[PDB]
Amino acid sequence: KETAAAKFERQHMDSSTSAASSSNYCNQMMKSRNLTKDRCKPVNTFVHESLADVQAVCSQKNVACKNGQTNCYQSYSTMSITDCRETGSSKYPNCAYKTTQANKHIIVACEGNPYVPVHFDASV
């Protein structure tokens, strides 16, 4: 079983680029991170920051999650992110995505020891 901390890193971290490299970034990344294996994941966000800066968010401001849970944390700085949304003509197994770049505060839910992000909750 992949851990929840490892799954967050696979689904949401891209420390290798400062921002989406092209309008095909999401098509490429949703495939290579295996987010289209048995269905098209309808939306996803990648964070273009170091793993240490995103893990640090779990020590920053404690806030409510989108669903009202209270183990969420909001980043002190805005972070570079890419939002991936499935296109209307996308049809598993042939998944297609629109790439949109943003720079926003991120909110993540954290768990565990070590206490790390296990869920990307929102950008604000």
């Epitope: 779990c58 404690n62 409510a64 849970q69 183990n71 944390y73 839910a109 954290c110 206490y115």
Partner: nanobody, 121 residues
């Protein structure tokens, strides 16, 4: 550095009462949930009581309902546990925790060093 400073607890006779206290220092914001967990030797850590910073969302383990009472100073990072009618099975190390949700220990990221509570017979 955040420090959760716990006080109180210790040795008491079965049937007796004790209070535990915990004040967080070093955190620049408000922890929405704080709580009390406990672990006996050899057993898994268990949530005892938790409360949110508005004085609501109060939750207790079934085995302490009616006997234990949690409280916080409204809007601040302090939490207290009054324990009455103590039983030998309440003997454990008790931990304050901050920053999680309800009684789910995996969600809490800041932990006190732990305070022994010993209930004798």
């Amino acid at each position: 550095q955040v420090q959760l400073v716990e006080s109180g607890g210790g040795l008491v006779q079965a049937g007796g009462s004790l209070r535990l206290s915990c004040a967080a220092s070093g955190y620049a914001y408000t922890y929405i949930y704080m709580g009390w967990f406990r672990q006996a030797p050899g057993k898994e850590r268990e949530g005892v009581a938790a409360m949110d910073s508005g004085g609501g969302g109060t939750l207790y383990a079934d085995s302490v309902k009616g006997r234990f009472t949690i409280s916080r100073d409204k809007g601040k990072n302090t939490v207290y546990l009054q324990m009455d009618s103590l039983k030998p099975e309440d003997t454990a190390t008790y931990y304050c925790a901050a920053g999680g949700y309800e009684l789910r220990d995996r969600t809490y990221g800041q932990w006190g060093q732990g305070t022994q509570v010993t209930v004798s017979s």
